[PDB]
Design a protein around this ligand. Structure first.
Ligand code: ATP
Ligand code: ADP
Ligand code: ADP
Ligand code: ADP
Ligand code: MG
Ligand code: MG
Lengths: 128, 1621, 145
């Protein structure tokens, strides 16, 4: 179908823009006492989980649109939202302005992950 | 002979014990001593039960069993007698003390007289022989009381209108339930029984003080013991009737308080504007007067001082005496602060806390007045303050006190409030007071709105208590309709009470609009009071409520509190909103509340503590991880602050307790000097916040604690006494107990944490994933507290989502307005009534199930400080202190903040329950509980063999970890695997015992026993961990086990381990040895009961046998048609003494479908231990087979009601009977589920709490080789009819498999929802050819291909929607046939018009199209003259269609799903073919008023004709005939099972049995049993009733249709007629 | 006669009030009729076959809701009530709604206070048009305030 081909390009393109790695902050006896580490650890922990979920969902959609895995109920719900351009409710994990569409969320989500990577990189290389 | 002594003692006790009799008003001799009777009977019942365990019980077994019967009969009699005597007492009082009721209800009055005669006659017999045994032997005494109880209940329910008349005479009765009101009215002479009801009619009156005679009411008392002595006592003798002296008591309460206020104001004025206050005099004045008057007196004195000071400052430049007003407050507050620094009586200490809170506000207001340089009494900064003016010269004592805020003026209601905890008077609370009093002056309602936990409800009550008003809180829901709200208004208006309706937007929008009319008319009446022209000596103000003229007291008010941010709530219509003044309460002043509360409790560093605790809660909400069960709001802060005062008091008591045994240096002042106040606060935080934390947040919060409270350490009390009892309870329950880091230590900490929450909260939640030890944590704690404290613990476990919300809380009758209690309301009311001493026991109500806002928000007033269950009938049930409300849940993803903030949280993680602990529990039970000691000896030896593999990091642990990495058809949980694994190992122990039965000479030795168990364990591990996965995943777990295990394994090179069983000789044996190549009898070809043995069938049957033989619930999952029903029924044949009953779930399936099955196959019987539900047939285990267990609709909160109901019956072994709110225990009932994979459309994932009990086996479609083996066997048998066609068996099977596989790939559910191809089509394919070959003596091979091609078109092409799809099927039938059948004449075998009919001959042989057309025209001519004179044009598609319909009408259970455009002839052709086959046509005669019970009666008519009269019927029904979804729930059962379990009930079933007996007699069958008759009736419906369903093609409708009626797509043959081409 | 619609008793009362009013010239107002779309269709059919008194008037109050039947909308005359278009229109509506004798009481300064209140009410309501800048939220400042 026409939608099946168009959605395949969009999902593959989104996997290019969205980053792929997010390393959790290493908890340390003196890092727990640091308030900045405590807040920043939450950001990556909730950020890493959201990053993996979106990438896995997008990869399944690409594989579905290549006719390699069968469409499940979750995929049917996700694919319907992506065709209509509505941001999936599963992806919605941080507060966003009302009326934000899926194309803006992917670009917004990609920027947030980059900042999350830099924060973890500083903690990994240099310390908290 | 110790047993003989017990029998002698039991015999001697009951040979002398007499019913203790008391005369009752010279009418009879009632029975007291119910506690003595019941405990004595229970004690002997336990002793008789306990002595059975003794080995010497055999000699005295008969005598003990005789006493067990007698003691049980004593219990059953006097448990009814007590309720009968109680009900007769107050009914006799009503039907004697009110002669008006005889005329009002003559029938009831005469009926009560007859019952009152039989009661008194039975009383006189008891008087003659008060011995219990003599009473127990009275003829029919058990049945006499049973009739008396039922008859007295009918009289009780017939007095409702009489009770509504008495409620007017004392309007506080409007807030009392009907039964309690009858107790009040009927016991008007027995005043001691009235005490428990005063808390319902009064704000703070818990009891009344009476003289020795009980004839004069001396005063009133509160629940805390505070007493008010009336100045003029009320005599009950001079005013005998209940509603007049109750009115006089209500008036004297107001008059005495006003007189007491005047005396208090006189004394407190000396303290005001005084330089120095002596503490002894001030404490004396506090102790002399009531708590409400003490604070009121302080407010009056302060107001008059400010008025006096501001009056002197009229010149402006005059010196300010306001500083003296501040000075007096400073001095008085210092004395109050000093008093609370030392020990005080509990009542005085609370009074001091109230005064400190009041004066801190007065200090703040006076400071604000001084800072703003206010010098005039008419300045608004003073007028905006709440002021208190007292006129001693006023003649009416009730109007001496005036409370004024801005322009609003109020009288004090002088309702006795007792000792109500006061709020800290914060700026938000000040703004709340100003706004609400402005609404009250405008005669408008108050509408505080905001998020949860901001003080909305408490502020409304605080303002009401400030004004001395009776404030009633109602927890509103959707059941608060127009009639319910109006009746509540009637009570509020006449009493003069304030109505605070919380969660007011939970009403339906239509009800909110309707209620606005009642609110408006009351408000207009309220303005009539405010009119100066109106005079008090005139006609009372009255408004019209519920079409009645109701007097309105000026003191009444209406308040609504709502969270406008909650989604799903009802929007208030504007006309309702204009009647209320709204105020936003969003940000409570937490630091001020914390500072004042800690300062009032006696903390010297309250300012330091408040500046730390409030930011600490803010930090926790942000620094800690985000969890749904996390709350750090004002309720959490309030809980810690209140707990801080309790912890401070216990330490002071502990410090001096150490001082008693160490010297005599009690120096209380110095004791408070060296008191670790910060450490006290940390203990309260940790006792309340820590149990809710996940593991990774625990170190975070302690780092935060060290950040805000440096150098302060938390140390739990080492609770040796409780831990010792817990350790013993764990041993008796086969549980693992640990201490610290030992095995089970984490779980024991959670048990101790749960105990701490029980002591601080009356409502608490245990939250954690399924299998976290939550249930065992509170079940063990309940038993441990019984042993530790001596208090019996009782748990009522409720599944709230297994029943409707109507059945949980109750319903108000739409017409009679009668209230029926729900399950929770009945349980709580039983505890409050305390007929059998429920108030002396620990009562835990555990809601084990899903939490959603729809039902749990009815408990908002229960879980908060109100502790009240409010019902729409106006009744309010107080939570007794011995009751805990508990919620055991797996998640809180749908609970709102309102619920989470109101409950103590104990979080369980899956790490709390370690896999080692579960292994220990299974092994401990295996070594102690016999499965049938020779059986226990086998288990014990087997336990030793299994022990090495069940250690941590053992074989099972490593296998479990690897299994979670694999893919499973359902979500994988640890306990589903282990539950399956332990069931299989129990069967292995039974196998060894069964072997010993077969070999009585040589029982299995340890070497053989060891050799068997290790291989069976490996076998059990594979099926328990991969039986729900595909073959590739089952294989992969095999190699992983092969690497890590040391158990010997099969040495085959490429054969998976899952392909091997374990023989009883401890040898691996291939499963292929049990798969013979059978030859099937030629008449059983593709019959429904015939199973061709394959590798999968023998393995699945053996696995099903193990689970079924253990009565373990199980689910078969697989694609539709994969053999789940076939495998289950095949396994049941090898398992006799088990009856299967098939239930077909739909999207609309509720638990009521299960209940109808119980009504037909099972009986409810009363046993001494409760109601037991068991199958009617004895010695049989009844199996409920649910075919679509995962179709039932999931609500918006992720819950399937029937699934919760099944989980309750499996895990709790029963359910609640909603008619009488009685627990029913299941016996000999097991459950088997079948379903499609949850990823399929319409299918929902099963709850993890249900899956832990239910092992899942995955049944896939047979592969190409398995299909060749199955239907190659069938084809060989069916081709023995024609010996000349034997050679073509293999090519015929190969063509069948090839085309079926191609069609299954070509057409899928993605294209159309009904494109499901399964081996069911293969079975129909072979059957169809076989039916066309039986009457044939010979046939050429080309004739065989034509039948093969014809059946392929009927099975694969008739459901296709598109012409391209039908073209592909037509072409590939030719391609497949010639590929497997060369050297055949294509034209004679594959001529495209393939038509078969038995209309032109005796046999089903091919028919020419033109010959068929002439025959149909000839028959249509007759059809016009006999049935329907509607001429039809005959085209080619009609001829094919009528042949297709004719085929289905000639098959048993032949159901049709005709899909096409309206007006295409679907109904007409069906009737025409039905007339050709002798089938009667039944169509339901719908109309605008045709309802569900019309459809049920129509269903009964068709079933009687086809089931009893042997009448072949074509039941033709269109989609338009479906006027309700309930129509198809009946048809879904009828299509699949040929029966509807609940259709025939009562007289209909009795008439059906008479007709079935007559019908079976005409057939020559010998049937007399009702069960035998019903089975024959079902078999007749199966063979005679044909259902034709016609519907238009709708893509959305067709897909949705599958869930509503799955039988339409797997029990009906679908023919896509579509539109005319 | 004013009736709220949501209750079952409200439907019975509405029919009796309408039947009495169509023979006497009485006025009937039914509020929140959008809460009963099904009953509204039956009311439209009832009104069609009726020749009431010349002075009879039936007022139906509803929110602007797509649930309101089209057939009822065509049968009646629609009046939309919404925020006034601007400051001038807001203040003219205020001065018409308040009776003249209310403003013109004994204190002559009362008139200027009402003008200030009318101006203040217009400015506050008009700022709602600027959803975010005028006020952070869409408060329901209205006639009751
Ligand atoms: N302390 C313990 N020691 C040993 N075995 C235990 C212990 N606690 C629980 N178990 C066992 O482990 C399992 C835990 O079941 P339990 O009912 O305690 O869990 P739950 O979290 O309440 O379950 P659900 O989420 O299904 O309501 C059961 O098989 C139980 O017998
Ligand atoms: N001014 C106050 N002083 C003391 N406690 C308060 C105050 N305001 C609220 N609380 C407490 O906060 C909690 C929530 O109050 P509640 O009236 O139930 O809030 P809401 O009705 O907004 O949900 C209760 O424990 C209540 O006693
Ligand atoms: N080994 C077998 N022997 C006989 N019939 C089989 C075998 N395997 C599959 N079938 C056929 O597969 C179909 C399975 O039907 P059923 O058990 O009702 O499926 P499910 O329960 O999966 O919906 C039947 O037509 C049955 O005859
Ligand atoms: N083959 C036909 N030739 C002539 N008229 C037909 C034919 N099929 C249907 N009709 C007409 O259409 C009417 C509706 O037939 P019916 O069986 O009720 O249609 P459906 O079940 O498809 O809605 C018939 O009463 C008849 O007037
Ligand atoms: Mg509240
Ligand atoms: Mg549990």
């Amino acid at each position: 179908p026409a939608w099946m081909r168009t959605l395949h390009t969009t999902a593959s393109n989104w996997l290019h823009l969205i980053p792929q790695t997010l390393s959790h902050l290493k908890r340390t006896v003196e890092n727990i006492k640091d308030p900045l580490f405590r807040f920043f650890e939450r950001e990556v922990k909730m950020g890493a989980k959201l990053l993996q979920d979106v990438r896995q969902d997008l990869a399944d959609v690409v594989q579905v649109c290549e006719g390699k895995k069968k469409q499940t109920n979750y995929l049917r719900t996700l694919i319907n939202e992506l065709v209509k351009g509505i941001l999936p409710r599963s992806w919605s994990h941080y507060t966003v302005p009302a009326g934000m569409t899926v194309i803006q969320w992917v670009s917004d989500f990609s920027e947030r992950i980059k900042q999350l990577q830099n924060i973890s990189l500083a903690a990994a290389s240099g310390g908290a | 002979m110790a047993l003989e002594e017990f029998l002698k003692q039991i015999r001697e006790v009951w040979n002398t014990y007499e019913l203790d009799l008391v005369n009752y008003q010279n009418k009879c001799r009632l029975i007291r001593g119910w506690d003595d009777l019941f405990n004595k009977v229970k004690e002997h019942i336990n002793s008789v039960s306990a002595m059975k365990l003794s080995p010497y019980y055999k000699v005295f077994e008969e005598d003990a069993l005789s006493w067990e019967d007698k003691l049980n009969r004593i219990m059953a009699l006097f448990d009814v007698w007590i309720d009968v005597q109680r009900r007769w007492v107050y009914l006799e009082g009503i039907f004697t003390g009110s002669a008006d009721i005889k005329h009002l209800l003559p029938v009831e009055t005469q009926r009560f007289q007859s019952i009152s005669t039989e009661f008194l006659a039975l009383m006189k017999k008891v008087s003659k022989s008060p011995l219990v045994m003599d009473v127990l032997n009275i003829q029919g005494v058990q049945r006499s009381l049973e009739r008396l109880a039922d008859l007295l209940g009918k009289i009780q329910k017939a007095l409702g209108e009489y009770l509504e008349r008495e409620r007017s005479s004392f309007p506080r009765f409007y807030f009392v339930g009907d039964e309690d009101l009858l107790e009040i009215i009927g016991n008007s002479k027995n005043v001691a029984k009235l005490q428990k009801h005063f808390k319902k009619m009064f704000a703070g009156v818990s009891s009344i003080i009476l003289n020795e005679d009980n004839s004069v009411v001396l005063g009133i008392s509160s629940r805390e013991g505070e007493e008010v002595m009336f100045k003029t006592p009320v005599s009950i003798t001079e005013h005998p009737k209940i509603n007049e002296w109750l009115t006089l008591v209500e008036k004297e309460m107001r008059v005495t308080l006003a007189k007491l206020l005047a005396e208090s104001v006189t004394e407190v004025e000396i303290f005001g504007k005084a330089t120095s206050i002596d503490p002894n005099t001030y404490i004396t004045w506090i102790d002399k007067y009531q708590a409400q008057l003490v604070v009121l007196s302080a407010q009056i004195a302060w107001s008059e001082n400010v008025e006096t000071a501001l009056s002197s400052m009229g010149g402006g430049g005059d010196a300010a005496p306001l500083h003296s007003v501040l000075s007096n407050v400073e001095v008085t507050l210092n004395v109050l602060a000093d008093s609370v620094l030392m020990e005080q009586p509990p009542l005085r200490r609370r009074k001091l806390e109230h005064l400190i809170t009041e004066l801190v506000h007065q200090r703040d207001v006076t400071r604000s007045l001084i800072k703003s340089k206010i010098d005039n009494a008419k300045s608004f900064e003073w007028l905006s303050q709440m002021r208190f003016y007292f006129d001693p010269k006023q003649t009416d004592v009730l109007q001496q006190l005036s409370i004024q805020m801005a322009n609003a003026k109020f009288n004090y209601g002088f309702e006795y409030l007792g000792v109500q905890d006061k709020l800290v008077q914060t700026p938000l609370t000040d703004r709340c007071y100003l706004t609400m009093t402005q609404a009250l002056e405008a005669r408008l309602g108050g509408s505080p709105f905001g998020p949860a936990g901001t003080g909305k409800t408490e502020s409304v009550k605080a303002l009401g208590h400030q004004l001395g008003r009776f404030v009633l809180v109602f927890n509103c829901d959707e059941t608060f309709d127009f009639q319910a709200m109006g009746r509540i208004f009637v009570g509020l208006c006449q009493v003069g009470a304030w109505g605070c309706f919380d969660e007011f937007n939970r009403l339906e929008e239509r009800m909110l609009s309707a209620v606005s009319q009642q609110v408006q008319c009351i408000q207009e009446a309220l303005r009539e009071h405010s009119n100066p022209n109106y005079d008090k000596t005139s006609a009372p103000i009255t408004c019209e409520l519920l079409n009645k003229q109701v007097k309105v007291s000026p003191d009444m008010a209406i308040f609504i509190t709502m969270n406008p941010g909650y989604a799903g709530r009802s929007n208030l219509p504007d006309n309702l909103k204009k009647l209320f003044r709204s105020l936003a309460m969003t940000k409570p002043d937490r630091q001020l509340i914390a500072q004042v509360m800690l300062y009032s409790q006696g903390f010297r560093t309250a300012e330091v503590l408040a500046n730390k605790i409030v930011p600490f809660f803010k930090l926790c909400d942000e620094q800690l991880s985000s969890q749904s069960h996390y709350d750090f709001g004002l309720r959490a802060l309030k809980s810690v602050l209140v707990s801080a005062g309790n912890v401070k008091r216990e330490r002071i008591q502990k410090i001096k307790r150490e001082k008693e045994e160490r010297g005599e240096a009690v120096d209380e002042g110095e004791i408070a000097e060296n008191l670790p106040e910060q450490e006290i606060l940390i203990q309260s935080v940790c006792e309340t916040m820590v149990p809710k934390l996940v593991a990774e947040d625990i170190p975070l919060l302690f780092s935060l604690l060290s950040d805000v409270f440096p150098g302060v350490q938390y140390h739990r009390g080492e609770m040796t006494a409780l831990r010792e009892e817990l350790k013993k309870v764990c041993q008796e329950m086969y549980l693992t107990y640990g201490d610290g880091e030992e095995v089970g230590g984490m779980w024991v900490e959670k048990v101790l944490q749960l105990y701490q929450i029980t002591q601080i909260n009356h409502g608490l939640m245990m939250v954690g994933p399924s299998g976290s030890g939550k249930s065992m944590a509170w079940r063990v704690l309940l038993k441990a507290l019984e042993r530790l404290e001596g208090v019996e613990g009782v748990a009522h476990i409720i599944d709230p989502k297994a029943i409707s919300k109507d059945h949980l809380y109750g319903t108000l009758d739409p017409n009679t307005r009668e209230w029926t209690d729900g399950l929770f309301t009945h349980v709580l009311r039983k505890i409050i009534d305390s007929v059998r001493g429920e108030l002396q026991k620990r009562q835990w109500i555990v809601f084990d199930g899903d939490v959603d806002p729809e039902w749990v928000e009815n408990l908002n007033s229960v879980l908060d400080d109100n502790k009240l269950l409010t019902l729409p009938n106006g009744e309010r049930l107080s939570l007794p202190p011995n009751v805990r409300i508990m919620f055991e849940v797996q998640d809180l993803k749908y609970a709102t903040l309102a619920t989470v903030s109101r409950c103590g949280m104990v979080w369980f993680s899956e790490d709390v329950l370690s896999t080692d602990m579960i292994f220990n529990n299974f092994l401990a039970r295996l070594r102690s509980i016999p499965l049938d000691s020779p059986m226990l000896q086998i288990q014990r030896d087997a336990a030793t063999i299994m022990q090495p593999y069940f250690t941590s990091n053992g074989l099972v642990t490593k296998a479990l970890e690897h299994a979670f990495q694999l893919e499973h058809i359902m979500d994988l949980t640890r306990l589903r695997c282990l539950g399956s694994l332990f069931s299989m190992l129990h069967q292995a122990c039974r196998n060894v015992a069964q072997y010993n039965a077969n070999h009585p000479d040589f029982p299995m030795q340890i070497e053989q026993l060891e050799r068997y168990i290790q291989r069976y364990l490996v076998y059990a591990i594979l099926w328990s961990l991969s039986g729900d996965s595909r073959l590739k995943m089952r294989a992969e777990l095999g190699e992983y086990i092969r690497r890590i295990t040391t158990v010997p394994l099969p040495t085959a090179p490429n054969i998976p381990i899952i392909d091997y069983e374990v023989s009883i000789s401890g040898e691996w044996s291939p499963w292929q040895a049990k798969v013979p190549q059978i030859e099937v009898e030629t008449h059983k070809v593709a019959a429904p009961d015939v199973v061709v043995p394959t590798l999968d069938t023998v393995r699945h049957e053996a696995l099903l046998y193990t689970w079924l033989a253990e009565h373990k619930p199980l689910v078969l999952c697989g694609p539709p048609g994969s053999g789940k029903t076939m495998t289950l029924f095949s396994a049941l044949r090898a398992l006799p003494d088990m009856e299967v009953v098939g239930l077909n779930f739909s999207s609309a399936t509720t638990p009521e479908l299960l209940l109808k099955t119980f009504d037909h196959y099972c009986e409810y019987r009363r046993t001494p231990n409760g109601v037991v539900l068991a199958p009617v047939q004895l010695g049989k285990w009844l199996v409920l087979f649910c075919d679509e267990i995962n179709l039932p609709d999931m609500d918006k909160y992720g819950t399937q009601r029937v699934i919760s109901f099944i989980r309750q019956m499996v895990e709790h072994g029963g359910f609640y009977r909603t008619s009488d709110q009685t627990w029913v225990k299941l016996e000999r009932i097991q459950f088997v589920g079948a379903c499609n994979p949850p990823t399929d459309p319409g299918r929902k994932p099963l709850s993890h709490r249900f899956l832990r009990h239910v092992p899942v086996v995955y049944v896939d479609y047979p592969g190409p080789a398995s299909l060749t083996q199955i239907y190659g066997t069938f084809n060989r048998a069916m081709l023995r009819l024609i010996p000349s066609l034997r050679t073509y068996a293999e090519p015929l099977t190969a063509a069948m498999v090839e085309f079926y596989t191609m069609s299954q790939e070509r057409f899928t559910q993605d294209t159309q929802p009904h494109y499901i191809y399964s081996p069911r089509e293969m079975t129909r394919w072979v059957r169809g050819i076989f039916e066309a070959l039986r009457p044939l003596e010979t046939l050429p091979v080309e004739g065989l291909i034509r039948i093969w091609a014809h059946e392929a078109l009927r099975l694969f092409q008739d459901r296709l929607v598109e012409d391209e799809e039908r073209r592909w099927t037509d072409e590939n039938i030719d391609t497949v046939a010639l590929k497997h059948f060369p050297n055949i004449d294509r034209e004679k075998a594959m001529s495209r018009p393939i038509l078969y009919s038995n209309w032109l001959s005796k046999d089903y042989i091919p028919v020419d199209q033109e010959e068929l057309r002439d025959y149909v025209k000839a028959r249509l001519k007759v059809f016009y003259e006999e049935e329907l004179d509607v001429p039809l044009v005959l085209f080619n598609e009609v001829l094919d269609h009528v042949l297709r319909i004719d085929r289905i009408f000639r098959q048993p259970q032949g159901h049709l799903l005709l899909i096409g455009v309206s007006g295409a002839g679907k109904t007409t052709l069906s009737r025409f073919v039905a007339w050709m086959n002798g089938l009667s046509v039944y169509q339901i005669k719908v109309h605008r008023k045709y309802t569900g019970e019309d459809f049920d009666e129509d269903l009964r008519t068709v079933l009687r004709r086809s089931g009893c009269k042997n009448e072949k019927i074509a039941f033709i029904m269109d989609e338009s005939n479906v006027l309700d979804s309930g129509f198809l729930e009946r048809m879904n059962t009828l299509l699949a099972n040929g029966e509807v379990p609940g259709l025939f009930e009562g007289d209909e079933y009795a008439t059906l049995m008479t007709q079935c007996k007559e019908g079976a007699q005409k057939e020559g069958l010998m049937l007399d049993s009702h069960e035998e008759l019903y089975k024959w009736f079902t078999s007749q419906v199966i063979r005679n009733l044909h259902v034709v369903f016609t519907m238009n093609p709708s893509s959305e409708g067709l897909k949705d249709r599958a869930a509503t009626s799955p039988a339409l797509f797997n029990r009906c043959v679908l023919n896509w007629f579509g539109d005319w081409s | 006669t004013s009736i709220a619609i949501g209750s079952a008793e409200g439907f019975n009362q509405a029919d009796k009030a309408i039947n009495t009013a169509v023979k006497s010239g009485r006025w009937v107002m039914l509020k929140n009729v959008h809460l009963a779309p099904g009953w509204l269709m039956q009311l439209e059919k009832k009104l069609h076959s009726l020749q009431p008194h010349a002075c009879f008037r039936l007022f139906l109050t509803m929110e602007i809701n797509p649930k309101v039947p089209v057939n009822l909308l065509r049968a009646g005359r629609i009046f939309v009530f919404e925020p006034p278009p601007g400051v001038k229109a807001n203040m003219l509506r205020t001065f018409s709604s308040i009776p003249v004798s209310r403003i013109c009481k004994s204190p002559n300064e009362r008139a200027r206070l009402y003008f200030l209140l009318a101006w203040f009410h217009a400015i506050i309501q008009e700022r709602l048009r600027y959803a975010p800048l005028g006020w952070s939220k869409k408060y329901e400042f209205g006639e009751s305030d």
